[PDB]
């Protein structure tokens, strides 16, 4: 059995988007199909339902009037038309087969992420996290103000990996993302060892190498 969602992506507030979900491995015509989403760092929320036997659409209160659920059984595909999109509709969208008393949500797609934001593409700024005066020091790089996700960071072009923590991005009150990458080191190597964070932001084609000095 399988479910493959497609069509997720970046949409401005008030924009519209159609998600699709191709189903295989089961008799599609015989199954109720639902949409379930997951906002960043959040739990699961049911979005909408469509019957098989003589369809009967249902929707979460927060989406009533704005979303439409449909299906094409000749194309083994479920749709979600989303209009008047809002920032809070930002989420990973899962299609799922609903089996009710024979199984609830026994089949899940991989999810497709829908991001709703007025923010425009921007490469990050990268600032050093500077070590200073037991025998151990920390340093790193602040990778600030970029959109959209993601950014990748390495240290010394891969070669420095012990003690590295690259934290998950956070969405700032600017609607721009920010992340820090840190490394703990022997204090003695400072001034002796050269440390460089390599920062890549593909959506803006942004590539920086920043030596973090003591």
């Amino acid at each position: 059995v399988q479910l493959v969602e497609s069509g997720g992506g970046l949409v401005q507030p008030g924009g519209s988007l159609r998600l699709s979900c191709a189903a295989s491995g089961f008799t599609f015509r015989n199954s109720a199909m639902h949409w379930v989403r997951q906002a960043p760092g959040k739990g699961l929320e049911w979005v909408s339902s469509i019957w098989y036997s003589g369809s009967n659409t249902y929707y979460a209160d927060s989406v009533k009037g704005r979303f439409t659920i449909s299906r094409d059984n000749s194309k083994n595909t479920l749709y979600l038309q989303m209009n008047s999109l809002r920032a809070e509709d930002t989420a990973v969208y899962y299609c799922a087969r609903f089996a009710g008393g024979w199984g609830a949500y026994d089949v899940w797609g991989q999810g497709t992420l829908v991001t709703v934001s007025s923010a425009s593409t921007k490469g990050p700024s990268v600032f050093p996290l500077a070590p200073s005066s037991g025998g151990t020091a920390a340093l790193g790089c602040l990778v600030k103000d970029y959109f959209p996700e993601p950014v990748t960071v390495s240290w010394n072009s891969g070669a420095l990996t012990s003690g590295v923590h690259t934290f998950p991005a956070v969405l700032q009150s600017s609607g721009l993302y920010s992340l820090s990458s840190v490394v703990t080191v022997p204090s003695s190597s400072l001034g002796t060892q050269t440390y460089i964070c390599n920062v890549n932001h593909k959506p803006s084609n942004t590539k920086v190498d920043k030596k973090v000095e003591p």
């Binding site: 639902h34 379930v36 739990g43 699961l44 929320e45 049911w46 339902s49 249902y58 979460a60 209160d61 899962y94 609903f98 089996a99 009710g100 008393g101 199984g103 609830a104 949500y105 026994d106 899940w108 797609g109 991989q110 999810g111 700024s125 600032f127 050093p128 996290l129 500077a130 200073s132 151990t136 920390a138 790193g140 602040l142 600030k144 923590h165 934290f167 998950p168 991005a169 956070v170 700032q172 920010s178 992340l179 820090s180 840190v182 703990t184």
Partner: protein
């Protein structure tokens, strides 16, 4: 509406130990139309139990579901390493399907106080009009930590954000960044920048600080 409340928020247990997770409803769930799902980071939910107590196909017998009415529980008789995950309950008994907000089952570990580090803003950022001050709490356990920002000893509120890593694959600890955003003017207007950290592994709050200039 049927509100689903999962307890506890987090269960901290070692492999081989029993896990007991609760799901209680605001109203009776008709026909015991209640399911349990497992979710790992970046992955889709996976069915475990449906109809309150039926095991999904190919789900290990160590997973079992029980309860009725408004009180339901998921038991993992013995946690395997692959079982540390988030678990959701789900009622599909009315026309408005709901989900509990989840129980995270995390690996229990020895208390480990964090190593704390504070970084001033860089001179390069300051010329741009903002100061980010970063406090790092490194490889601690448990996950609960209170991190306070103090500027000239005045508690800050509303101007920092936290970020946490997943439990370390090797040592099962967490690390956490707290970031303070100030205006350059506010930054330059004060002298002492302190990160206050409260945690189980520390008998007393640990303060890391610097003076601007």
């Amino acid at each position: 509406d049927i509100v689903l409340t999962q307890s506890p928020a987090t269960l901290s247990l070692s492999p081989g130990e029993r896990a007991t997770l609760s799901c209680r409803a605001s109203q009776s769930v008709s026909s015991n139309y209640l399911a349990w799902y497992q979710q790992k980071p970046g992955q889709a939910p996976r069915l475990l139990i449906y109809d309150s107590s039926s095991r999904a196909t190919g789900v290990p017998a160590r997973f079992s579901g029980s309860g009725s009415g408004t009180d339901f529980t998921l038991t993992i008789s013995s946690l395997e390493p692959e079982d540390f995950a988030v678990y959701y309950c789900h009622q599909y008994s009315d026309i408005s399907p709901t989900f509990g907000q989840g129980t995270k089952v995390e690996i229990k570990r020895t208390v480990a106080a964090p190593s704390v580090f504070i970084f001033p803003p860089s001179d390069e950022q300051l010329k741009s009009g903002t100061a980010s001050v970063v406090c790092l709490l490194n490889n601690f356990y448990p996950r609960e930590a209170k991190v306070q920002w103090k500027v000239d000893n005045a508690l800050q509120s509303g101007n920092s954000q936290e970020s946490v890593t997943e439990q370390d694959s090797k040592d099962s600890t967490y690390s956490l960044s707290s970031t303070l955003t100030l205006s350059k003017a506010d930054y330059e207007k004060h002298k002492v920048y302190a990160c206050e950290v409260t945690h189980q592994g520390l008998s007393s709050p640990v303060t890391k600080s610097f003076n601007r200039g």
